[PDB]
Ligand binder design. Structure first.
Ligand SMILES: COC(=O)[C@H]1[C@H]2C[C@@H]3c4[nH]c5cc(OC)ccc5c4CCN3C[C@H]2C[C@@H](OC(=O)c2cc(OC)c(OC)c(OC)c2)[C@@H]1OC
Ligand SMILES: NCCc1c[nH]c2ccc(O)cc12
Lengths: 377, 384
């Protein structure tokens, strides 16, 4: 039924973001467990975190003709196979080499599942009005999975073991497939104008703060904070709660006070939050700056997503998910460059210099948002 | 007696800054009985001369104390206001403005130095400067309408005669409290100024003050011309358009002088520079007078934040690194103030005719924004 595809797409996006967030506080702690010095391993940790983003990067365009040739269900189903294999590989992983392959399959399955499920949702709903509601429900499921995943893996590692949240995620995925078992202006012309490129760089630089924080904040915590091993994923809860509050709030506020002002203020608070992050000497210090950073990224997304839609609509022709490809290129850009470059930058210089560099980059990029106010064509 | 030094500087900056803004709506209307440029050179005569006397005023405070410079500032302000009251031509009004400049330089350097010296606790010192800047904000707030209504009703010399009487009362108060009759040299030999320009920290703080006050100082000469060119506003609203900046500057300087210590000086300066840059960014987007109360109030709050944060941070730096002599650093701060006040009004029309007002606002705002993260350098400067 029409509701069935909605529930399977909701579950798929939920589990995908859950895997993304659950991999975060397990890898550094798993690395700590075996060697029983992370400055030498941090660069490969960053590469292992960016592998999914880079593989997704090379795999986005190929799904396009593949969707047309063989429909939408089969790419949706194969996404299941890849993420189920990635989940079982994550739980049984004992070697770094296996984990890199699992991250690569995670990227493949995430790209396949996202594109195929969004296309299937577009195909099923042809009423021209409920499509937006269905997309909103799917994105709400994405945000909810983002909120839930980190407390899942962090709490359920030292309490009921290491293979627990991956096995439970695989079981929930198996419930997903049982439910599912029963245009123009290409993106490489839409990157041809300075306005859309500035907006994409805006979203990429806004998300690069959390992208660079994810590989390095847990290792920073075990090196100075001495926090308990169950608290690492809990230490990112402000970045999700404040993100949800900010994204809901600024959306009504955004149009009254201008989208460009929202984006500029969001980048300013992103830079300030990243600067204020490396001074905390205990976990309660991180709640302020991390909550501010989450609210900032929520403001930036809620201001720049409609401005990207307006920019695509006013000059070019957009589709149901034409804005999807541009933003995801920024997200994969950040999650491939920030994690990869971050290991080298923390090996060469300290983590505080990394945070200062990212904050300064956001601050200097902040004045460029004037370019988007009333653009012409 | 530690509190009685704050009330003196509270009234010294009140009267001297009163004559700065009262003369603004009284000189070009009086002279009327290329011409705009000669009028604008009147205003910047204080700003140019005060910049040069400042390097000779700062080190002078070391060798004679702080009382005599403030007494001389009282005398010079008395002479400047009296000469303003009677002079009725350009060459007679230029010397009066330069005299007001020299008096303002004396009063500002001596007052900020004596507040820094008598207030030793850093959090406690962060409050005297805030209230003194509040008195300054109230002075520039009441200066313009005072001169306007006095010139409309009671005459031209009367707003300057009353200022002379208040200056006489200020001199009596100074002779009662401070006793400026002897030259007292500071026991500690203060550091030379040109070593202090080799400190990155002092240069960054002075640059922050200079860029914020350049942002405020560029706006005042250039805003009313753009107003008449674009919105076609009646003349009576011109001075009222800048009132929220003064009001917000007073409120912000009091409030953030209270909390700059709890919230953090570097974060206060950074947020203030960011908000002043953003406010100048949205200033040339106003399509009527009602759109300017917001950004102007934000600009005033930003400048009050940056001023209350960086005003005691200079004393903090000079105590953490250099010797405990405060004349030179606050002389540099007043130099930054006067440099911003000097580049603005003489070159405002030239820059507007060259590139345009919105591009000037964009340039100043982007300069403030990119200079903002350099204030993170002031988080914890190492000691000697
Ligand atoms: C991880 O997986 C993601 O990459 C998602 C998130 C990335 C990032 C993040 N990661 C964290 C990990 C944490 O634990 C350590 C803690 C906090 C965070 C935060 C806080 C900040 N944050 C944002 C998250 C949001 C998701 O993006 C969308 O919701 C979205 C919205 C849209 O418009 C409504 C779109 O347009 C239709 C769209 O498609 C282009 C996507 C985004 O991509 C799917
Ligand atoms: N130093 C405070 C700058 C300033 C704030 N408000 C003002 C009003 C008028 C003026 O000439 C200057 C100002």
């Amino acid at each position: 039924s029409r509701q069935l595809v909605l529930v399977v797409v909701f579950v798929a996006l939920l589990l995908d973001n859950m895997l993304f967030t659950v991999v975060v506080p397990i890898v550094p702690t798993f690395l700590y467990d075996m060697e029983f010095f992370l400055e030498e391993e941090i660069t490969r940790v960053g590469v292992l975190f960016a592998s999914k983003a880079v593989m997704q990067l090379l795999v986005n365009p190929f799904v396009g003709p593949l969707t047309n040739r063989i429909g939408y269900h089969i790419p949706m189903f194969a996404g299941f196979v890849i993420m189920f294999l990635s989940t079982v590989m994550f739980a049984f992983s004992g070697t770094y080499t296996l984990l890199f392959v699992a991250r690569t399959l995670q990227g493949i399955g995430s790209s396949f599942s996202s594109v195929a499920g969004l296309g299937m949702l577009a195909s099923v709903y042809t009423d021209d009005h409920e499509r937006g509601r269905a997309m909103g429900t799917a994105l709400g499921g994405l945000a909810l999975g983002l909120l839930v995943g980190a407390p899942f893996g962090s709490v359920m590692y030292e309490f009921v073991g290491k293979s627990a949240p991956f096995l439970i995620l695989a079981f929930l995925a198996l419930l997903d497939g049982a439910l599912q078992l029963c245009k123009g202006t290409p993106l490489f012309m839409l990157l041809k104008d300075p306005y859309i490129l500035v907006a994409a760089g805006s979203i990429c630089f806004a998300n690069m703060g959390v992208a660079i924080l994810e590989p390095t904040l847990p290792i920073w915590m075990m090196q100075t904070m001495c926090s308990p091993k169950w608290q690492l994923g809990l230490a990112f809860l402000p970045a999700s709660v404040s993100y949800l509050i900010g994204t809901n709030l600024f959306g009504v506020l955004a149009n009254k006070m201008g989208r460009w002002l929202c984006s500029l203020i969001g980048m300013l608070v992103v830079g300030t939050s990243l600067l204020c992050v490396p001074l905390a000497h205990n976990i309660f210090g991180l709640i302020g700056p991390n909550a501010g950073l989450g609210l900032a990224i929520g403001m930036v997304d809620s201001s720049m997503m409609p401005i990207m839609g307006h920019l695509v609509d006013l000059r070019h022709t957009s589709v149901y998910g034409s804005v999807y490809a541009i933003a995801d290129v920024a997200f994969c850009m950040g999650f491939a460059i920030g994690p990869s470059t971050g290991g080298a930058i923390v090996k060469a210089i300290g983590f505080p210099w990394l945070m200062v560099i990212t904050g300064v980059i956001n601050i200097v990029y902040a004045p460029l948002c004037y370019y988007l106010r009333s653009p012409p064509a």
